[PDB]
Amino acid sequence: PSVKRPHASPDDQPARKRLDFG
Amino acid sequence: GTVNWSVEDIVKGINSNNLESQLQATQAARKLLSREKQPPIDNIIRAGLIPKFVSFLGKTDCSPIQFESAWALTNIASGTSEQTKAVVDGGAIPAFISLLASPHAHISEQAVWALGNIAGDGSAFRDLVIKHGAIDPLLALLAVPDLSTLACGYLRNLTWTLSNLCRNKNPAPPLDAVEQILPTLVRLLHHNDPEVLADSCWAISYLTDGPNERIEMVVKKGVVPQLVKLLGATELPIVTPALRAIGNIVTGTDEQTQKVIDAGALAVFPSLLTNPKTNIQKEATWTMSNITAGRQDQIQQVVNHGLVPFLVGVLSKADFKTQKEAAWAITNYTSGGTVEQIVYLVHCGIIEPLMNLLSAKDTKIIQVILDAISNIFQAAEKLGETEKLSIMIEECGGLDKIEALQRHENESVYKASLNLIEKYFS
């Protein structure tokens, strides 16, 4: 009984939020 | 000049009825919020300044105060969900969308960045940004014959903001908006700047983390050959999301998985399965495990590319998480494979490292190994070589570990262990 198993822990990723320092 | 004011001075300046005093104070605020060590976002919110900044966003006659307020609000919206919420509650979203058409490139870029910070808060603010109409003007900023005429920082910021519009789930982004965005996204996936490529691959991986219909709308755009190409890159920031996207796509149907195999992806996995970065190894093994869960001709493609010895390798020596994914790949292989294929698995050396892993404490990995052992014996009974395999397992110390597992806290573990011993070793 083989099964495709989606990603364990999906959320090196881009920052969700970014401070603008200059 | 405007360096190092107090919130008190900034307030008096904003509350004067002098546009130029207001501009000075807004720049002072921006400079407080652009310092490194813990900007006083909460002090600025508490002083009531967000509504004023938001009103300054609409002063077409004074583009500098538009810029300074846009930057200040960008930096407030980059904080906690409560601070981003304070910016949204001030009416900022429609005002930033209006600014996206500014004739001043730095004001437009600042608006792009602020909307990216707001959408990066989560699904609700992402969908609210979309409902106010941001996608149309964002995509119009990129509607040029050759992306290479745009300034590099500008294009990187636009790409990051788009990637955040494609991000998060529960719910996933609206399907109409995904179809609006995808063409521009594929174009950016063919750009030559590494940061644009990394963020585009991230967006694609976000969109493929869903049900097979999202996967399908992405695969129908023909991005898989380009994803395989990027899977080959040398920059880890590009390989990592390219591998994530390929893995997501192969969690889908057998025909989507086949689109990945036909683009050449398997030829890359000898490197990926021996990659010095643990995360690459783990993600590549998880991908392999979802491919060995496919059809028999797909398993045969895995065999033909020579990847079984690489699986034996990761199973023999690797970070334990990578080894657990390799166990899953072996179990899916022995579940779906022909007898010749399972025989081949054994001739490559799977049994000894599989047995060595039964000394582990994780219960599900042990369960998975026992399922794989069952499947292998059951291939052997089809050939009558079951005695040879029983001996082989006894000889590397596996049967000792199985016997010990007969008396395990888990029920199905003890059940499978005792079944194995009383059915093949008696």
Residue numbers in the entry:
A (entry chain C): 139 to 149, 159 to 169
B (entry chain B): 72 to 497
Question: Could you give the paper's own sentences about this structure?
Answer:
The classical nuclear import pathway comprises a cargo protein within the cytoplasm binding to a host transport adaptor protein, importin-alpha (IMPα), via a series of specific, basic amino acid residues known as a nuclear localization signal (NLS). These motifs may be either a monopartite NLS (binding to only one cargo-interaction site on IMPα) or a bipartite NLS (binding to both the major and minor cargo-interaction sites). The AAV capsid protein, VP1, contains four motifs of positively charged residues termed ‘basic regions’ (BRs), and these (BR1, BR2, BR3, and BR4) are suspected of acting as NLSs for the transduction of AAV capsid into the nucleus. We have revealed herein that the N-terminus of VP1, from an AAV isolate from bats (09YN), interacts with host IMPα2 via a bipartite NLS.
A structure was obtained of AAV 09YN Cap-BR in complex with IMPα2 in which the IMPα2 was structured into ten sequential armadillo (ARM) motifs and AAV 09YN Cap-BR was bound at both the major site of IMPα2 (ARM 2-4, P1-P5 sites) and the minor site (ARM 6-8, P1ʹ-P3ʹ sites), in a manner typical of a bipartite NLS. The overall binding buried a total surface area of 2773 Å2 and is mediated by 25 hydrogen bonds, 16 in the major binding site and nine in the minor, and three salt bridge interactions, one in the major binding site and two in the minor binding site. Surprisingly, of the three basic regions, only basic region three bound to IMPα at the major site, while another region between BR2 and BR3 bound at the minor site. Within the major site of IMPα2, AAV 09YN Cap-BR Arg163 interacts with the side chain of IMPα2 Asn235 residue at the P1 site. Lys164 acts as the predominant binding determinant for the specific P2 site of the major site with hydrogen bonds to Gly150, Thr155, and Asp192, and also maintains a salt bridge with Lys164. The P3 site is occupied by AAV 09YN Cap-BR Arg165 which interacts with IMPα2 through hydrogen bonds formed with IMPα2 residues Asn188, Asn228 and Trp184. The P5 position, however, does show AAV 09YN Cap-BR Asp167 forming hydrogen bonds with IMPα2 residues Asn146, Gln181 and Trp143. The solved structure also shows the minor site-binding region of AAV 09YN Cap-BR contains the canonical ‘KR’ motif typically seen. These two residues, Lys142 and Arg143 both form hydrogen bonds with the IMPα2 protein in the P1ʹ and P2ʹ sites respectively. The P4ʹ binding site is occupied by AAV 09YN His145 which holds both a hydrogen bond and salt bridge with IMPα2 residues Glu354. Intriguingly, the Cap protein NLS of the bat AAV isolate 09YN bound IMPα2 in a different bipartite mechanism than expected from the porcine AAV data, with BR3 binding the major site of importin and a region between BR2 and BR3 interacting in the minor binding site of importin (Figs2 3).
